[PDB]
Amino acid sequence: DKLALKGTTYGMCTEKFSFAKNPADTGHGTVVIELSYSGSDGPCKIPIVSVASLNDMTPVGRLVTVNPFVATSSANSKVLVEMEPPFGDSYIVVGMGDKQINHHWHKAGST
Question: Where is coiled-coil annotated (predicted)?
Fold first, then answer.
């Protein structure tokens, strides 16, 4: 019902992401992804970044749904988030300060 998002001293930790399904568009610029968060630390801010393929210096991909934070009691399963990446391959990296993972996705590349 009520969702307050503050920036007070918090600890973002959610590198436990599992890709269950590829990113699919469900409308106009709306991609849906289903990854299971296997983290026994509870809810936490998932440090993830969405940028075009080969672009880690500028922001390009974005999460349509609220920030990538598993602030839930049942997010320990195949959760589902949204992303509005621009047409073209995109390099997304789901990792925190310590260990981090990086993956990419291509939907087309013809001329």
Answer: none
* Dihedral angle computed from the Cα positions of residues 59, 61, 62 and 63, in that order, rounded to the nearest 10 degrees: -140
Q: Which method was it determined by? A: NMR
Report the chain's terminal Cα–Cα distance, integer Å: 47
Q: Give 13's contacts (C-beta < 8 A, 6+ positions apart).
A: 39, 41, 44, 45, 47, 96
Q: How many Cβ atoms from other residues are within 10 Å of residue 5's Cβ?
A: 8
* Nearest in space to 13 (alpha carbons), one of 69, 61, 66, 67: 69
Domain 1-111 class, CATH top level:
mainly beta
- Please enumerate in sequence order all residues whose Cβ is within 8 A of that of 28, keeping only pairs 6 or more positions apart, or say none: none
